[PDB]
Amino acid sequence: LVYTGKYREDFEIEVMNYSIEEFREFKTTDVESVLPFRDSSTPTWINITGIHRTDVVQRVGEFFGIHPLVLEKILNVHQRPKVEFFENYVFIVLKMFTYDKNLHELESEQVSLILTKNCVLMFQEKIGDVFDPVRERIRYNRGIIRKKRADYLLYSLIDALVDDYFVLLEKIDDEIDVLEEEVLERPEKETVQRTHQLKRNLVELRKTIWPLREVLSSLYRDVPPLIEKETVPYFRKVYDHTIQIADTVETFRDIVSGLLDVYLSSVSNKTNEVMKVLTIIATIFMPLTFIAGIYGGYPVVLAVMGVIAVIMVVYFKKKK
Amino acid sequence: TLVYTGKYREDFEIEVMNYSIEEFREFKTTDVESVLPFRDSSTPTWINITGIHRTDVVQRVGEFFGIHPLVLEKILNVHQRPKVEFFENYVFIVLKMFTYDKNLHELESEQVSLILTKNCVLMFQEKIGDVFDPVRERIRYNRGIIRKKRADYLLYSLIDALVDDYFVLLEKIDDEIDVLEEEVLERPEKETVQRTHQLKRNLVELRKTIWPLREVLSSLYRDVPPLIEKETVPYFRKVYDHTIQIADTVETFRDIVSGLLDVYLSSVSNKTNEVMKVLTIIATIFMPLTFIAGIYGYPVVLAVMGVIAVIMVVYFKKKK
Amino acid sequence: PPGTLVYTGKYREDFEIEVMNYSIEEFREFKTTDVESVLPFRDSSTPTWINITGIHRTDVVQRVGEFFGIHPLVLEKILNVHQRPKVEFFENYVFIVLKMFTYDKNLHELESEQVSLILTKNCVLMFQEKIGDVFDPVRERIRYNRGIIRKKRADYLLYSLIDALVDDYFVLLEKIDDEIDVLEEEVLERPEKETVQRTHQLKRNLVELRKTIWPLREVLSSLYRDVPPLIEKETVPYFRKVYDHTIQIADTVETFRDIVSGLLDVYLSSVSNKTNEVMKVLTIIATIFMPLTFIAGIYGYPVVLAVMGVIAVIMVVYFKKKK
Amino acid sequence: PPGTLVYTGKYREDFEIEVMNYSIEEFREFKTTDVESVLPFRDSSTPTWINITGIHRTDVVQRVGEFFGIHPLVLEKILNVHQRPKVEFFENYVFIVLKMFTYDKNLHELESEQVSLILTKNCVLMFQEKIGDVFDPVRERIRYNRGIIRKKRADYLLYSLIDALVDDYFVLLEKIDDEIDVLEEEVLERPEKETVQRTHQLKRNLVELRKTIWPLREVLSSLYRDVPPLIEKETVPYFRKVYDHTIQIADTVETFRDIVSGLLDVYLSSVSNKTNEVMKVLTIIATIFMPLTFIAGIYGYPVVLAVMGVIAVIMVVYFKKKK
Amino acid sequence: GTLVYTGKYREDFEIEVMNYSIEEFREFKTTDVESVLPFRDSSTPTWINITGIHRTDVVQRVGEFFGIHPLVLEKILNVHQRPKVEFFENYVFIVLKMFTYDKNLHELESEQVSLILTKNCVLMFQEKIGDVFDPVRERIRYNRGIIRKKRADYLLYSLIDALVDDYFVLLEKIDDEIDVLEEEVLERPEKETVQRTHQLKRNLVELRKTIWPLREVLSSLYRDVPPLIEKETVPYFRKVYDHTIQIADTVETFRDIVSGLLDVYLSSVSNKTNEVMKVLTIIATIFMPLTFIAGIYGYPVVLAVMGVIAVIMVVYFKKKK
Ligand SMILES: [Mg+2]
Ligand SMILES: [Mg+2]
Ligand SMILES: [Mg+2]
Ligand SMILES: [Mg+2]
C-alpha cells in the first residue's frame, strides 16, 4: 500500500453516529476508537482524512474486510471515478474540485466512499471538503436524514458533492462571459493565453464528469444493500443532476471552442481599419509631397494640391 | 424544502378548464382550494398553475394529488433537462418553452411541467405567457375531437402545441441566418461578428434542449401506461416524429452557422488585400519619383519621371 | 385542429390524376380530375399506379384516404411537406415519404418536392405537390411493355418507382460534382468576391442534401430488411439494389462535404500569400527609397550618387536572401 | 430498363479473355476473344482463373452470367462501376467487388478501376474494365509452380488474388506517405502557390482512398467471419491474414487524413509569420527614416546630424524590445 | 509462407534465456539457436528473448520447433501492424509496440515486440537490442516480488506490465513538451515553434494509433483467458487492462489540448502583426503631413502648427491604440 498523492499535511478521523432520537460525534487520531462502529446498529459516518497514512487505511481495511485491491485503489489518486459492487460493501471513487480564480487553474482531491451495513467509510487526502451541509442536517436534526439509514447517508454525501459541481460550473460560466468580452472587446495579450487555459480546464473537467455520470447511473440502475424501492429515487435525483452537469460542460466546451475564431475575426477587422488609415494618409500626402518636391507657382499649386486632396476624400466616400 | 430556483416572481394565477362531450366550464382563481376538488372529476380537467414561485401552492396541489416530494422539487427547479418520469398513478413531464427576441438577438426559456393523472392534467408555468391558446380554442369552441376524448389526449394536445411552437422559433432563427450570411460577406464590421457568435450560442442552448425533448416523446411513444393504448399512441408518435424533424433542422443550422466566421475571415482578408494593393501602387510609384525629385538639394527629368510611372502602371497590368 | 387536413406546402398550381392499370396482356391508362373514377381500381386484380398530383386538394386526399382505409394521421403526414423521408408499415399498406430534388445551376440553389407513396394490395397510390416528376422512364416501360414490369405485380411497381427516384439523385450529384470542380479552381485560381459566396452556398446545399439522403437510406434499409406485402422470395433483391444505391449516394455526399469543407481554408491560404507578396514589394520599395530619399534630403555630389547607388545594391543583393 | 445490362463506366478501349487452368502436375494458359472457348471450364475439375477484361461488352458478361447461372442483379452490379466494395453470398457462388487504384506521381492524381470476382466450385471469374492490373505475381506463382498455389484449389486462388490487390494498397500508401513528407516540408519552408494546390489534391485523394478502404475491410471481415464454399479451418486463416492487412491499411489512412488535415493550418501559420517579419522591416525602416527625412526637410549642422544619429539609436535600442 | 523481414533493424543478433523456479535460477546469452530449443520442454518457466528477427532463419527454426503456424511467423517478421492478440490451441500470440521519445530532436521511434505464451515458455522477439524489461530481469535475478513462485502466464503479465508502465513515463515526457510549447506558441512566436507543434500532433497520432489497440489487446487477455490460470493471474491482467484505459484517456486529453495550439499561435501572431501596423500607421500618419508642409517650401508659426497637429494626432491615438 503506497500513497501516490501529494497531501501529507493532515490526519484526522471524524465519526458521526446518529439515530432518530440522539446523535454522537467526535474526532480522534486513534483508529481503534472507531472500529467498533462497524457493528453499530445505527448509521455511522466515519470520515478518515489523510490517506497518506497507509497503515490506518490497511487497518480499517482489514477490520471491515475490504479486498486489498480496493485498498490500493483508495490510495491511488490518479483514477477515474467509479463504482465497484461487492457482496458486503459498495465502493465508490469521486473527485472533489477547486477553481482557483485569478490564477486560472483547477485543482482536484480524491474522495473514496464505502457503503457497508450501517457505515459509510469515507477517505480524503486532506482537510477541506464539501460535506458540511450534511454535518449540519445531522447535527440539527434537519431534513429526514436522522430518520433514514446508511444508504441515505451515502446519497446525502454524494448529492452534496455533485451539488458542488454546479457551483464550480458557475465560476467557469463567469470566466466564459469575461472572455467572450475580451475576445471581441478587450483585445489583449492575456486573452488568448486565458482562452486556451479555459479549454484545458474544461477538458480536465469533462474528463471527470462523464465518469461521475457513469457512477450514478450504476447506483441508480443496480442497487444491492441500498434499500430498493426506497432510496433509489433520491439516487436518481443525483443521477439526473450529473446528466445536467455533463450537458452543461459540453455546452461550455462548444462555446469556448469558438472563441479564438471570434478573436481572429475581431483582429483581422481591426487590422483592416488600420490599413485603411495608413492608405488614405499615404494616398493623399504622397502625390502632394511629391509635387511640392518637384521644386528643387504658388497659389495655383496650393489650389491643385487642395483639389486633388478633395477628389480623394470624396472617393474614400466609396469604401472607407 | 421547496425552493424556486427560477427568476419569475411577478405573476400568479390558476386557470381551470373542465370539459366533456356535452358541456364546458372554465374559470380563473388565485385560491388553490377551489381547484383541488377537480382531482376527482370524472371528466378531463386542465388545471394550469402559473407562478410556481409560490412554492406553497405547489406543495398543496402536490400533497392533495399525492405527488412524491422529489417530483415537487423537480417542478420548482428550472435548470433541468426535459424529461419524463413514470409513476403508478401519474406521468410527470418537464418541457421548455422558448422565446426569440429578434433584433436584439437573445433567446429566453420558460419551464413548463406537466402531470397526467386519472382525469387531470396539472400544468405548472413560471410566468404568464404560453403557447397553448389553440388548445383553449378547441375546447372552448368544441372543435376537433378534443372534447370527445380523455385526459391523455389532452396531454398530447398540449405537448403538440408546444412542439409546433419550436417550428415557429426555428423559422425565426432561419431568418437571422439569411441575414447574417449576407452581412458576413457583404458588410465588414464589428457587430456582424458579435451577432454570429450570439447565434451560435443560441443554437447550442437550443440543441441542448431539443435532443432531450426528442427523448421525452420517444418514451411516451414507446412505453405507455395510462395513455390509452392502441388509441392515443399514434398521436404521440406524430409529435415524436416532429421532434425528430426539429432535431434535424437544428443540426442543419449548427453546421451552416459554424462556417460563417470562416467566411467572414476570408471576406475580410481579401478586402484588406485590396487595400494593400492601392497603398503599394501609390508607394511604388511616388517613392522613386519623390526620390529623384529630391536628389536636387528639367523636362528631361519630368519625362523620365512620367515614363517610369507608366512602366509601373503597365506592370500593375500584370496582377492588380 | 390537428385532425383537419391542411396542406402546409406552397404548390397550388396543378391538379390531375393519372392512372396506369397494366397486366401481362393489356394496359389501360387515363387522366381525370374526378376522384371517383379511380377509386374502383382499389380492387383491381392487376397492378394499378394511381398518381395524384396536387395535394393542396385536401378533399381528394381525404376521399382516397377513407376509401382505401388509410389512418388519418397518415393523411396528415402526406399533406405535411416538411418532414424526413420515412416508411411506416401497417396491416394492409406500406406508407413511404420521399423527397424529389432540383438543382438550378447558375443560380446555385436547389429546391425539393415531396412525394408520398402507398403500396396496397394491387395499387400504388402516389401523391405529388405539383406537375413534374422523375418517373417517366417507368411510364415508358409500362407503355412499351419493356423490361419485365408488366409481368410482375405492384410491389415491383413500388420498387420501380423508388429506383427511378434514387437514380435521379445520381444525376443531381453529378451536377454538384461539377460546381465543386469549378470552385476548386476559383478558390485557388480566380481569388475574388463571388467565390466565397458560392463556396458557402455549396456547403449549404450539401447540408440540405445530406439531411435527406441519410433518411432515404434508412427508408430503403427498412424495405430491404423487413418486408410484409412485398413478395418475399421475389422482389427483395431489387429493393436491395436500391438500398445499396442509397449507400453509395450517402457515401458520395460525405465525400463532397469533406472536400468542400476545406475550400475556404484553401482560399484563405491562397489569399494570405498574395497579401504577403504585396507586402514584399512595398517593403523593398520602401526599404531602398527611404534612406536614399533621406540622404538626398539632408541637403538644404558623385560621391553621394555613388554611395546612393551602392547601398541600393547591397539591399537588392540582400533581397536575394528572402524575396 | 434496369434489367437490360448497361456499362456505366468509361473504358471501352479493350477486350480480352485470359484463362489459367492449373493443377498440381501441369498448367495451361491462353487468351481468346471468343467467350464460348472458356465456358467449358465451368466444369473443370481443377482450379481455373478466367479473367475477362473489357466489361463494356455487356453481351459477353450476360453470356458467362447465364452459363455459370448468376443472378441478373449480380450482373448489373458487375457493370456498374460506381459502387462500394462488397461481398454477396449465394448458394453456389460468392460475389465480390473491389477497386484497384493507380497513383500517378508527379502529376498528383489517383485513378481507380473496378474489379469484380466470382468464386464458384472450381473457378474464379474475374471482370476488369481495361487491360492493366496487379495480379501478375499470382500469374508468376502459377506459371513457375511457386508457393503452394498449385497444390491448393479455387478458394485459395480467390485469396491469392485479393491478397495481391490488398498488398498493392500498401505500395500505394507508401507513395502517399512520401508526398506527405515532401509537403510537410514545403508547407513550412516554401511560401508558394503550388504547395496549397498540392495540399488540397492530397486531401482529396485521401478521401477517395478512405472512401474505399473502410468498405474493403468490411468485405474481408465477411469472408473471414462467415465462409460457405471456402474450405473451412483450411483457407480461412489466409483470409484472416488479409483481413488483418485491411485493418492496418484502414488505420494508416486515418493516420494520414489527420496529419494532412493540419497542413494548411501549418502553412497559414508559417505564412502569417513571414508576413509579420516583412512588416517589422518595413516598419523599422519607416519609423527611423521618416522623422529623420522630416527634420532634414524642415530646411525649406553637425548638431542636427548628431540629433539625427542619436534618435536613430534610441529607436534601434527600442526595437530591442520587440523586433 | 516465405519469411521476409520488412523492418529496418539488422544491427543486432542475440538470444537470452532466463529459466527460473521457486528455488533456482539460470540465465545465459547465446548465438546458437539450438542451445535454447530444449527449454521448450522445461518444467519451469523460461523467458527466451530473441533479439534480431532480421534473422528469418532463426525465427523459422524456433517456429517449427515450438510448432507455430507459419502465418504467425509472417506476422512476427512484419513490423507494420496493429497490436493484437491471437489465441491458438497450444499458444497465445501477442504483438506490441515499444516506444522511445528522443527529446530535443522531437521524434519518437517504435520497435515491435511479439510474444508467445506456451506451456512453460514465453518466446519474445525483438528487432534490436534495447527494451523495457530490465526490471523484470532484476525481480527474477534477485528473487523479488512473487515472480519466481508463479508460472509462465504470470511472466507474460510481468513483461506486458513492464511495457505498459513505460507508456506512463513516455506520457510524462510528452506532457512536458506540451507545457513548453504552450509557452512558445504564445510567448516566443517563431518558425521552429510551428514545426514543433506539428511534430507533436504527428507523435500524438502515432501514439493514439497504438494505444487504443493496446487497450483492446489487454481487454481480450482480461476477458476470456485460455492457458492463463484463471481466477489466479487474471486480476493482474486486469490491473494492466485498467492502466491502458488510463493511458488511452490521457492521450485523448493531449490530443485535444494540442489540437488548439496553431489556432493560439495564429491568433498570437495576427495580433502582433496588428501592433506592428499600428506603429507604422502612427509614424506615417504624423510624419507625412508634417514632411508635406515642411516641403511646400519649394517660421516658428509653422513649427508651432507642425507641433500642434502632431499633438492632435497623438491625443487621437488615445481613442484606439
Ligand atoms: Mg531646396
Ligand atoms: Mg398541430
Ligand atoms: Mg480552423
Ligand atoms: Mg502538466
Coordinates of N, CA and C in Angstrom, one line a residue, chain A residues 138-200:
Chain A
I138 N -27.5 16.5 10.2 CA -27.4 15.5 11.2 C -27.3 16.2 12.6
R139 N -26.4 17.2 12.7 CA -26.3 18.0 13.9 C -27.6 18.5 14.4
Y140 N -28.3 19.3 13.6 CA -29.5 20.0 13.9 C -30.8 19.2 13.5
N141 N -30.8 17.9 13.7 CA -31.8 17.0 13.2 C -32.7 17.8 12.2
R142 N -32.2 18.1 11.0 CA -33.0 18.7 10.0 C -33.3 17.6 8.9
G143 N -33.9 18.1 7.8 CA -34.5 17.2 6.8 C -35.0 15.9 7.5
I144 N -34.7 14.8 6.8 CA -35.1 13.4 7.3 C -33.9 12.5 7.5
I145 N -32.7 13.1 7.5 CA -31.5 12.3 7.4 C -31.4 11.4 8.6
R146 N -31.9 11.8 9.7 CA -31.8 11.1 11.0 C -32.8 9.9 11.1
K147 N -33.9 10.1 10.5 CA -34.9 9.0 10.4 C -34.4 7.9 9.5
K148 N -33.6 8.1 8.5 CA -33.2 7.2 7.5 C -31.9 6.6 7.8
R149 N -31.5 5.5 7.0 CA -30.3 4.7 7.3 C -29.1 5.1 6.5
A150 N -28.2 4.2 6.2 CA -26.8 4.5 5.9 C -26.7 4.7 4.4
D151 N -27.5 4.0 3.6 CA -27.6 4.2 2.2 C -28.0 5.6 1.9
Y152 N -29.0 6.2 2.7 CA -29.5 7.5 2.5 C -28.4 8.5 2.9
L153 N -27.6 8.1 3.8 CA -26.4 8.9 4.1 C -25.5 8.9 2.9
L154 N -25.1 7.8 2.3 CA -24.3 7.8 1.1 C -24.9 8.7 0.1
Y155 N -26.2 8.6 -0.2 CA -26.9 9.5 -1.1 C -26.6 11.0 -0.7
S156 N -26.8 11.3 0.6 CA -26.7 12.7 1.1 C -25.3 13.3 0.8
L157 N -24.3 12.4 0.9 CA -23.0 12.9 0.7 C -22.7 13.1 -0.7
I158 N -23.1 12.1 -1.6 CA -22.8 12.2 -3.0 C -23.6 13.4 -3.5
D159 N -24.8 13.6 -3.1 CA -25.6 14.8 -3.5 C -24.8 16.0 -3.1
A160 N -24.2 16.1 -2.0 CA -23.5 17.3 -1.5 C -22.4 17.6 -2.5
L161 N -21.7 16.5 -3.0 CA -20.5 16.6 -3.8 C -21.0 17.1 -5.2
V162 N -21.9 16.4 -5.7 CA -22.5 16.8 -7.0 C -22.9 18.2 -7.0
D163 N -23.7 18.6 -6.0 CA -24.2 20.0 -5.9 C -23.0 21.0 -6.0
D164 N -21.9 20.5 -5.5 CA -20.7 21.4 -5.6 C -20.2 21.6 -7.0
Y165 N -20.5 20.7 -7.9 CA -20.1 20.8 -9.3 C -20.8 22.0 -9.9
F166 N -22.1 22.2 -9.5 CA -22.8 23.3 -10.0 C -22.2 24.6 -9.7
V167 N -21.7 24.7 -8.4 CA -21.0 25.9 -8.0 C -19.8 26.2 -8.8
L168 N -19.1 25.1 -9.1 CA -17.9 25.1 -9.9 C -18.2 25.6 -11.3
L169 N -19.3 25.1 -11.8 CA -19.7 25.4 -13.2 C -20.0 26.9 -13.3
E170 N -20.6 27.5 -12.2 CA -21.0 28.9 -12.2 C -19.7 29.7 -12.3
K171 N -18.7 29.3 -11.6 CA -17.4 30.0 -11.6 C -16.8 30.0 -13.0
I172 N -17.0 28.8 -13.7 CA -16.5 28.7 -15.1 C -17.3 29.5 -16.0
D173 N -18.7 29.4 -15.9 CA -19.5 30.2 -16.7 C -19.2 31.7 -16.7
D174 N -18.6 32.1 -15.5 CA -18.3 33.5 -15.4 C -17.0 33.9 -16.2
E175 N -16.0 33.1 -16.1 CA -14.8 33.2 -16.9 C -15.2 33.3 -18.4
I176 N -16.2 32.5 -18.8 CA -16.6 32.5 -20.2 C -17.2 33.8 -20.6
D177 N -18.0 34.4 -19.8 CA -18.6 35.7 -20.0 C -17.5 36.7 -20.1
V178 N -16.6 36.7 -19.2 CA -15.5 37.7 -19.2 C -14.7 37.5 -20.5
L179 N -14.4 36.3 -20.9 CA -13.6 36.1 -22.1 C -14.3 36.4 -23.4
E180 N -15.6 36.1 -23.4 CA -16.4 36.5 -24.5 C -16.5 38.0 -24.8
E181 N -16.1 38.8 -23.7 CA -16.0 40.2 -23.9 C -14.6 40.4 -24.5
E182 N -13.6 40.2 -23.7 CA -12.2 40.4 -24.1 C -12.1 40.0 -25.6
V183 N -12.6 38.9 -26.0 CA -12.2 38.3 -27.3 C -12.7 39.2 -28.4
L184 N -13.8 39.9 -28.1 CA -14.3 40.8 -29.1 C -14.4 42.3 -28.6
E185 N -13.8 42.6 -27.5 CA -14.0 44.0 -26.9 C -12.8 44.5 -26.0
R186 N -12.0 43.6 -25.4 CA -10.8 44.0 -24.7 C -9.5 43.4 -25.3
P187 N -9.4 43.5 -26.7 CA -8.4 42.7 -27.4 C -6.9 42.9 -26.9
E188 N -6.2 41.9 -26.5 CA -5.3 41.9 -25.4 C -4.4 40.6 -25.3
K189 N -3.3 40.7 -24.6 CA -2.3 39.6 -24.7 C -2.7 38.4 -23.8
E190 N -3.3 38.7 -22.7 CA -3.7 37.6 -21.8 C -4.9 36.8 -22.3
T191 N -5.6 37.4 -23.2 CA -6.9 36.9 -23.6 C -6.7 35.5 -24.3
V192 N -5.7 35.4 -25.1 CA -5.5 34.2 -25.9 C -5.0 33.1 -24.9
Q193 N -4.0 33.4 -24.1 CA -3.5 32.6 -23.1 C -4.6 32.1 -22.2
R194 N -5.5 33.0 -21.8 CA -6.6 32.6 -20.9 C -7.6 31.7 -21.7
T195 N -7.9 32.0 -22.9 CA -8.8 31.2 -23.7 C -8.3 29.7 -23.7
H196 N -7.1 29.6 -24.1 CA -6.5 28.2 -24.1 C -6.6 27.6 -22.7
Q197 N -6.2 28.3 -21.6 CA -6.2 27.7 -20.3 C -7.6 27.2 -20.0
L198 N -8.6 28.0 -20.4 CA -10.0 27.6 -20.1 C -10.4 26.3 -20.8
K199 N -10.0 26.2 -22.1 CA -10.3 25.0 -22.8 C -9.6 23.8 -22.1
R200 N -8.3 23.9 -21.8 CA -7.6 22.9 -21.0 C -8.5 22.5 -19.8

